[PDB]
Amino acid sequence: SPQPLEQIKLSESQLSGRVGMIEMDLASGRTLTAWRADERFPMMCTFKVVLCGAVLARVDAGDEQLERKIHYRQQDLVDYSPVSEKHLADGMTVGELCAAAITMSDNSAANLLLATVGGPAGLTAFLRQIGDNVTRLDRWETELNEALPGDARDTTTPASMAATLRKLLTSQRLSARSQRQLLQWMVDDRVAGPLIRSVLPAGWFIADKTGAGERGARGIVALLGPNNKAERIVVIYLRDTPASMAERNQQIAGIGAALIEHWQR
Ligand SMILES: OC[C@H]1O[C@H](O[C@H]2[C@H](O)[C@@H](O)[C@H](OCCCCCCC3CCCCC3)O[C@@H]2CO)[C@H](O)[C@@H](O)[C@@H]1O
Ligand SMILES: CC1(C)[C@H](C(=O)O)N2C(=O)C[C@H]2S1(=O)=O
C-alpha cells in the first residue's frame, strides 16, 4: 500500500469523486492524518451515532428510559426497516430502537428516535450543545440521503464528526454507562463489523457505523487499533462518484489498509 494520503489521492482519481478523511487519536483528540477534513459530506446513517448520543443524554437527564417501549404504526415505516417492520404488534424499547438504528441501519427506528429528540432541528440543537457548530441534520429518513451536489443539508465534515464522536464516547458529557452503551452499539454493528473483522489482521479492534446515499455517497465512522484496543477514530466519506458499491467499499478498505500498513507514526 502507498502512504495513507497517497492512497486517498489514488482513491479520488479512481472513483472520480470526492473523499474526506480524518484519523484522530482517541485518547487526546490529536489529528494524525487529514484530507478534505473541513469539507462537507452527507452523513447518511453515520448520523445515527449522534442520534443515539442525543437519546442517551435524555436518559442521563432523566427525560428518557432505554426500557421504554415505543409502539408505532405501519404508516410510520420508511424504506429499509429490517427490525422495526417485525414489531408492529409488540413495539420496541428505546434501547432496542437504538440498537436497530446503529447495528442494522434501520431507517424507521432512526426516525422514531429522531422524534423523541425533537426531530432534525432538535438533533442539530444537540450538536450545537456539545460544541459542534458545523454538523447539521435537516431531514428525516430517507430524504436525508439525497446527496445533491453542493447541498449543505444533512452534512458533516470529517473533522467535525471525529471531534463529535470523541466527545460522545469519552468527554464525560454522557454518563459512564451511556458512554459504554454507545460504544457497545458500535461494537455490535451487523452491517459491516463482521465483514471488516474477517479481513482485519489478528489483534485489531473494530467498532463502526456505515452509511450509503445517492450519487455514490458512502461513509464509515470507526474506532480502530492494534492490541485489541480502540486507539483511533477513523472517519471516511465518499461523495459524487458513479462507482459501483463494490468498488466504493474496496476503496474505503484500501484507505484502511494503508492506515494499518503505515500505523506507527
Ligand atoms: O503488516 C500488517 C498486516 O498487513 C496485512 O494485513 C492486511 C489484510 O490482509 C487486509 O485484508 C487489509 O485490508 C484492509 C481491510 C480493512 C477493513 C476496512 C477498514 C475500515 C474500518 C476502519 C476505518 C477505515 C475503514 O489490510 C491489511 C493491511 O495491508 C497482513 O495480511 C497481516 O498479516 C499483517 O498483520
Ligand atoms: C445497509 C445500507 C447499504 C447502508 C449502510 O449502513 O451501509 N444504510 C444506510 O445509510 C441506509 C442503509 S442501506 O442503504 O440499506
Q: What is the CB-side half-sphere exposure of residue 218 using CA atoms within 13 A? A: 22
Distance in angstroms (rounded) separating the CA atoms of residues 212 and 165: 19
Q: Which set of grid coordinates corresponds to residue 191?
A: 452491517
Residue nearest to atom 7 of ligand 2 (CA): 211
Q: Which residues are registered as beta bridge partners of 232?
A: 25, 224
Ligand 2 atom nearest to CA at 145: 10
Per-domain residue ranges for the chain?
A: 1-265
Q: For the domain covering 1-265, report its CATH number.
A: 3.40.710.10
Model resolution, angstroms: 1.4
Measured in Å, residue 223 CA sits from the centre of ligand 1 at 14
Residues with Cβ within 8 Å of 104's Cβ and at least 6 positions away in sequence, in order, are 82, 83, 190, 191
Residue 203 DSSP label:
T
Question: Mutate which of 24, 199, 236, 265 to test ligand 1's pocket (most atoms within 8 Å of Cβ)?
Answer: 199
Ligand 1 atom nearest to CA at 252: 25
Distance in angstroms (rounded) separating the CA atoms of residues 51 and 30: 24
Distances from the Cα of 213 to the Cα of 45, 54, 94, 148, 185, angstroms: 9, 23, 25, 10, 22
Is ligand 2 within 6 A of the CB of residue 45?
yes
